[PDB]
Symmetry: C2
Subunit: 509 residues, 2 copies
């Protein structure tokens, strides 16, 4: 009664914004009343099929307007939706289905049908969920639309606890982070402030919904403020350009490579993209889009000056909160308190690296089906991020890296990320990776693999002496190797296993 | 763990903003760590004196920085503070003390000591609270400062439920509206979006803290965003002008008569008030202050285009939410859903007047010690405002007046405020009051008392026939009396008893 849920957002919008367009996806266009009507029918069918409080629905597909519908329908029943990774190969898909154990699976035939069939065959006699094909013929009795059309118009009208999860997002051993109605609304509210979002926002949903990013910037704040969410299935520069114009989009999730592709296509065509408020790499648009002047962009937050993770409902610490910041992440937004805690659970001094810990409204509810990990990661009433950081003297925060990589050299635990960050402050260094190499007396020594800027020179020694004045002696590398670039995985992440193989790594705890 | 309280705000600010000024009150200046330290000491002494979850503290004084300290200290203990009306005469002060039944009273000697002594005398042997004089000599053992100085620096560190009340404000039969941590933070968060408030905001607290206004715009959002709150005890034009300059205030609570005093006082002095962002009557500043360009001002909300009450944590419906609005109040802010309900609890159609009802995060917890009224005003899971309104076709809302004035003509309940609003739409009418006059057959007939614009003419019949096309026939006035202005009370409120006396009113239900 004194607590807003996602259901409450739609019920209010259908009354306050009867004529406004809420969702667009290909030829589908829905006003707030039309969306809320569909949500009600869908919730009606879900309830008749036995879905209620705590029940679970998995989405296996690319972006679609139906993801918003399911989140809201589920939300009106106190159920939850996992937006799964559509690229999962059969082993990972099987693992996610077995872990999350959905009562219903809404799947996409286009692009992934072979993987889906293989996975269902792999599940064998454990495949007991209902499966609804979302991109079906509209009359397909095993399809989403026919399931929805059999529902009635009445609102279920249940008292749903807003702390109950509604969106589940898998994060990398994969774990499902449980985001409540409260988490999402606090995130969206904070984001509306950051980005100056309102009912005139028109956001192109070109980021993956299996990640928190697209929801934060700006799927959910647009929904909260009654603006227009335009969906695209894949990112094809020509199609994106046409949607930016035809839907008069003010915001979109567009990374630099896609930006440059769009810009090249649009050069000298006269198609007008000036309504778009570019947050990422504004300069690359070459004046074709307007540079965003919201706090999000002006502060540097949009260029990466912040810290977050799914479990904090996204990018929850930024340089937009609280002014100039010495630390690379800025400060926590409202509804978040952050402490840097040492190994004993005590608060670190200024300058000292420790684990970033959090309390507040954007902290998730835990992982799905991880009782032990949850008990441990919430110990002493703080959420433990497994990310390493420090407070600066001005009060702001620096994010250093993960705590999940660790060296143990004799008695001492050493966090590579701390040493990496230290070496990366040298102006001659582009990037550094730190590994441990065996030492028969005390398990490990520290080794750095360093990638220099092309126009700079430093030696093994200058980089060791560079470490002396701000990291503890026992953390300095015993040797430095120089490389043209770091090895990376097919996904473009640092390849630590390949580092260990090339440079003699081992002896880890 | 996943819920922010007022205590969490200060704990975070002490870490993120170690050098910023939080409060200024005369010579008192407090950074966030200094404020949080005082709060902790104060909480220490409160707890040692027995104050804990659900306990109550009454403030009987003018504005002071200690009000923020008390609210925060109380909040760290799960206790609550009533900011009482310092002008209460002894009967009303006694009523409030007996009703709220505080364990502790923090009182002011200046200006009101005689009233306070009379009231304590009146309470006789029921005066069992601790009384602490806030404006005492610093060492006064019955004073606030000595009580606080005896507390230790440690943070009490309790797990406080944010739905628990922390601020209590009396609303006129007086009733104490209970505002939770959540209510205040949701109000402050929405206000920060409305007014573009951040850590650089410096707000002069020149509105009375016994009313929600000063808290909403902009005491609490400023606190939330870590800006600077400057306190003044009373509003003297010269002192306000000097504080606006010396503290470089960006915002202040200043009504038009005070604005014109300040303006005349400052004319050709060269004192620079340009940092001030005028929200109310910006034209009246004559270029000496900057006209605010936040949504709050641009939308008309600051000039009165909205609707709210204490029990909705203030001005909760405004023209700033959701764009142009045909209705005089706009639309609900996020975390608020509004329905116009008829007498039977059913939702009114578009255009039909009924009671404004609300669910959501800004809805208060109820009144203190009003079990029956609370059960009734929360019936069917909606908070009932006792304010009358309607939805317009565009989805926006119109506020018509109160439902507490009612006529009953034969079988029909008639709301004077609906008829008043209708008559006030005529361009020749400045203001209209509607009363009931006795009718021996069916109890009451409708009568209008109408105040014309100085430059217009209309007759009794124009005004009756004016009503025909909107309101129902039985609601039209049977007679109209014209008046030079409406009688008002010493507080400047409409004087309905004097209307009844003058124009033969009676026969009410």
């Amino acid at each position: 009664a004194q607590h807003t849920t996602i259901g409450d957002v739609l019920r209010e919008h259908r009354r306050s914004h009867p004529g406004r367009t809420a969702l667009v996806d290909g030829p589908v266009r829905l006003t707030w009343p039309e969306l809320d009507d569909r949500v009600n029918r869908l919730a009606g069918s879900l309830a008749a099929s036995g879905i209620g409080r705590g029940d679970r629905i998995m989405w296996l597909g690319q972006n679609s307007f139906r993801v918003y519908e399911l989140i809201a329908a589920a939300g009106k029943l106190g159920a939850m939706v996992c937006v799964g990774y559509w690229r999962w190969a059969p082993p990972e898909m099987e693992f996610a289905l077995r872990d999350f154990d959905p009562h219903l699976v809404v799947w996409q035939h286009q692009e992934i049908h072979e993987t889906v069939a293989r996975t269902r065959e792999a599940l064998g006699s454990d495949d007991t969920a209902r499966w609804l094909r979302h991109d079906s013929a509209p009359q397909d009795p095993d399809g989403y639309e026919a399931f929805l059309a059999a529902g009635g118009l009445a609102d279920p009208d249940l008292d749903i606890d807003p702390d109950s999860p509604v969106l589940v997002l898998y994060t990398a051993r994969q774990c499902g982070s449980l985001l409540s109605h409260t988490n999402l609304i606090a995130m969206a509210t904070a984001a509306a402030w950051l980005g100056d979002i309102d009912h005139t926002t028109a956001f192109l949903n070109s980021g993956p919904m299996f990640h928190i990013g697209n929801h934060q910037f700006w799927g959910m704040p647009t929904l909260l403020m009654a603006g227009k969410n335009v969906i695209v299935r894949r990112v094809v520069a020509e199609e994106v350009r046409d949607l930016l114009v035809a839907e008069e989009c003010t915001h979109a999730f567009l990374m630099p490579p896609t930006v440059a592709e769009i810009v090249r296509l649009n050069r000298d065509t006269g198609h007008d993209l000036s309504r778009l408020r570019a947050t990422v790499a504004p300069h690359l648009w070459e004046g074709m889009a307007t540079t965003d002047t919201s706090r999000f962009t002006r502060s540097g937050a949009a260029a990466g000056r912040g810290y977050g993770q799914t479990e904090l409902s996204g990018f929850a610490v930024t340089a937009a909160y609280g002014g100039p910041a010495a630390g690379n992440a800025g400060r926590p937004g409202p509804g978040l308190t952050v402490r840097v805690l040492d190994t004993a659970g005590r608060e670190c001094a200024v300058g000292e690296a420790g684990e970033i810990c959090a309390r507040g409204t954007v902290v998730h509810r835990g992982y799905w089906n991880r009782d032990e990990v949850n008990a441990h990661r919430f110990r002493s009433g703080w959420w433990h991020t497994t990310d390493l950081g420090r407070r600066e003297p001005d009060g702001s925060l620096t994010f250093l890296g993960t705590t999940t990589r660790m060296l143990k050299s004799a008695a001492e635990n050493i966090f590579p990320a701390e040493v990496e960050n230290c070496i990366e402050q040298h102006p001659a260094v582009r990037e550094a990776a730190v590994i441990g190499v065996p030492n028969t007396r005390w398990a490990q020594d520290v080794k750095a693999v360093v990638v220099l800027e092309p126009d700079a020179g430093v030696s093994e020694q200058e980089i060791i002496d560079h470490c002396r004045p701000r990291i503890a002696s026992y953390k300095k590398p015993k040797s430095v190797a120089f490389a043209a670039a770091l090895p990376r995985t097919v996904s473009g992440a640092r390849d630590y296993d390949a580092l260990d193989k090339e440079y003699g790594g081992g002896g880890y705890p």
